[PDB]
Design a protein around this ligand. Structure first.
Ligand code: AZA
Ligand code: AZA
Ligand code: AZA
Ligand code: AZA
Ligand code: NA
Ligand code: NA
Ligand code: NA
Ligand code: NA
Ligand code: XE
Ligand code: XE
Ligand code: XE
Ligand code: XE
Lengths: 295, 295, 295, 295
């Protein structure tokens, strides 16, 4: 037997950083959860009990805190690239670093219509994520994403004209509820190294904001023919607005809300045009994915 | 042996309701999770296998949908009271109904600075809850609450002057992070029945909004001497603003963020005034509770 | 305004303890999660910012580890009583301690049919719990419980003869699946203090084992007329086997498995006597409770 | 823009099946959660709103129940292959089916030392899983796995001789607690189609049992030099026992239990050889992976 692939590191490292502006007194907080996994010439730790090749996962944890102390932690694409590059430059036998970062929302509070200098609220479990793979001699590959964005529209969604055979019971509809949790990922063109990542720093926050805005606007305005059709429109717009993205991937659950027939009870009308009360379904759920790239 | 207490019913009943304004085209959605438990002369179902006394839990589920179809579902204090009263009026041998409602946020989306007519976002897992106990011959007791409101302030929290003995290692501090998940409950004076609950309907939403606002403002502005001291100030203000509340209860975790000493690494300074990077702690956590009532 | 009730302390304190038999080489592990909340003359910490009355929650955490170091941690009823008594004896102004303990399963592994000396498996998320309230001048009240015991029987459950009215759609049945997560609590007679708790130590593990065995046997053997009828039989037997228990409480979800009518597809028969494939329902669920005490 | 990849289907479909032996009266239950995603000539549903190519996800759900009605659901490798093959044979434009199955434990109860005919217990959240990819013209690829197997050993684990530099604070140790949640996957050689999968049916349950047994025995008996070294030994043995497996992958968290220094309190000794009470750490955690294949 032989080691075909191996990676190891530290997962679930929670980090908080505060920035204090001495002039204005305004404080800004960042909180993230970080995972770092390494690859390289480490087979002998598995096959021969040779620990000499292991950078201890506890040391990786230390490195994350130290790196956050000495560098900006925003945008996460830059922080992840700094962190990944560190390991391949510092350790001769480590040849790849894989860095995953989940950014948690801490939104500045408005008290009496003005921004508070040092108080924050978690407005939703929506996350902004990055995956950074730093591979020696092959540059830096970055995938950025938003996830946990939960939306619903109560009309202007349709689903008709699908294949009907002996396995089909689903009725066609011209008016339904559509609700989903959005997971959207955009993959950047490969960067040659940290200098190139630094040169594009302004594009990271801007593209995240664009992806979010396009998602919300298209969802709200599209008279949706299907999840498939609507998500494609989203991806197409993002690719058109940022030339440095190669692909956009969406993964969307279709969270069903079922009509409840109440006609058995005193002829009560609660279906079709008369539908007011619905039963949200916890499971099963549709799952629809697509990856859109350039012609 | 004898039955000392018994209650039974349906839990986790998810309900969605939509309201459609025909004039404006504006739609508004409500989504809740409902639990209804009944008490009464039902001992024989336990002791003698006499099912004749059981209103099936499946029927309770049906009743929830039917009631939501025929009545407004907002404010939840009113809907819960209607639902509870139904069971004690309909069934001779049922003498109490306990109704718990969790309201989930569906916040109207703003697209291009204007409110969208039928698209919504889940902005946070914060909930608005009610517990309604309708007891035959004793009226209606309502406890209203908000929960899952997660906040953090990065300074203006202190904790010093606590008891120090041979079990104490905690250092006094004049500047720390304070973060909590707020659970706040206000208990209404007993209402004689549904007519009285209806007469106070405007106070329910208004008091919820006040409780939320007082919580946020006090948290952000108090130079906090302890969780205990700050939460007391919150409760005091709520009681002063709404005479129909008898008690306010807060239950607050103290979610710790620990300094990380980095001085072992090249003398790096990251404690006290130099603290920038912290380690959020998942567990253990302080838990601080208090119930405040009138003199 | 005035403080009507207050309690504070440390929640979610994870503790592991190992016992090493030097003779046999056999090791035994215990793992628990502990919560301790205190009450007493502490109002001024809320109302006057007087921290002098506060035993820091961090010190409570320390005390839990120290107490576990110096005392046995099993049975949990004894450990919780020692821990609670400590606070009321040590601190003049503290007059009640509330201790909750969740014990996690670490079951010794059998390798090649023999018990391994130091390797363990988590066989299920079933927990054994205690709640201990130590109140100065009123002794020690202990509630013991098991929770998270998930069972299913595929036949020998019935449900017919329930009330039928205009809210009822549920069909009577003489053969259904019954599945539940068992939560069972037995409340001990009040103990005068630690000496009395010590004198009954052998009864704690024995009663837990009896409660578990009665639950499983009765569930498996009862031709159940309802959840209500079956749970009553369980509680009755536990009370008969241990005179020092005053009350037994069960709280049981009814986790529904629905028939699936497949007759629309080529006349396929999958209901009543022909039912083979079912759809487990995540929600809603029946919830049935009862407290049984002595005549 | 163009569709580079697309897949869609139904997730979280819960299924229960019962088998009734008419002779013996013995009943056996199976419960699973199933996900089916399809690929094929479906781009136009995304790009042109052409629903004619969509097999509705609701129909996929129906197909899962129908298939479970007409076929055995065990071993899951066979059921998943039947289910995947169905879609590529039934629909001309569908060219791949991806089927994921999670099997939940329902273990027959022993009452008074004998196996009960129709009552079951969920003994742990351990799962047995399969991923089956059926690709038209390329056969059937099956990955089988166990996950959620949580173990701990209290001694006979070491970790010393790792790289030490200016990022390292971790002390070497010759005696520590080792605890992990096992995720192990074995990948079968490609099968040409359903006939070949059927011919190997006995090997599926046997290999699962072997993988489990090797994991447990090696964990309990290895005087572990590291997670890396121990997991390699597991994978090596599995590959040696089943020639039809091509690769074995393990993914293992290192769930840390920290010593607690209590010497500040009356010189209490709780570290090194005197360590009895430890603090389980919820996060961060080591994560160690490896894929082992044949020379
Ligand atoms: O078994 C281990 N492997 C590792 O790679 C490691 N790093 N810190 N502790 C560790 N333990
Ligand atoms: O055992 C049951 N008890 C009940 O009260 C009930 N209601 N619906 N189904 C039921 N089953
Ligand atoms: O605000 C606080 N209250 C307390 O009771 C406490 N105990 N430790 N830290 C603390 N902080
Ligand atoms: O938008 C949808 N896409 C689908 O593929 C589907 N299948 N059932 N309902 C559906 N809705
Ligand atoms: Na390198
Ligand atoms: Na009544
Ligand atoms: Na006292
Ligand atoms: Na095909
Ligand atoms: Xe951070
Ligand atoms: Xe609702
Ligand atoms: Xe413990
Ligand atoms: Xe199944």
């Amino acid at each position: 037997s032989a080691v075909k692939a191996a990676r190891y590191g530290k997962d679930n490292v929670r980090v908080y950083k505060v920035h204090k502006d001495e002039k204005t007194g305004v404080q800004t907080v960042y909180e993230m959860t970080v995972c770092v996994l390494l690859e390289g010439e480490i087979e002998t730790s598995y096959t021969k009990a040779d620990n000499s090749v292991i950078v201890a996962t506890d040391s990786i944890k230390n490195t994350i805190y130290i790196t956050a102390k000495q560098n900006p932690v925003t945008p996460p694409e830059l922080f992840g690239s700094i962190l990944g590059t560190h390991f391949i430059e510092k350790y001769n036998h480590i040849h790849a670093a894989h860095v995953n970062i989940v950014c948690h929302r801490w939104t500045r509070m408005d008290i009496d219509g003005k921004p508070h200098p040092h108080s924050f609220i978690r407005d939703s479990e929506e996350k902004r994520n990055v995956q950074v793979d730093v591979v020696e001699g092959k540059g830096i590959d970055i995938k950025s994403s938003l996830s946990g964005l939960t939306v619903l529209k109560s009309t202007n969604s349709q689903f008709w004209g699908f294949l009907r055979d002996e396995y089909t019971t689903l009725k066609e509809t011209w008016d339904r509820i559509l609700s989903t949790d959005v997971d959207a990922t955009w993959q950047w063109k490969n960067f040659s190294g940290l200098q190139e990542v630094r040169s594009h720093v302004p594009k990271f926050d801007a593209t995240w904001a664009t992806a979010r805005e396009v998602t919300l606007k298209t969802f709200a305005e599209d008279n949706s023919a299907s999840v498939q059709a609507t998500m494609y429109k989203m991806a197409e717009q993002i690719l058109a607005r940022q030339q440095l993205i190669e692909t956009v991937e969406y993964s969307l659950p279709n969270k069903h809300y079922f009509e409840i027939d109440l006609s058995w009870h005193k002829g009560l009308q609660n279906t079709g045009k008369n539908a007011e009360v619905f039963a949200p379904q916890s499971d099963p759920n549709g799952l629809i994915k697509c990856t859109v790239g350039r012609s």
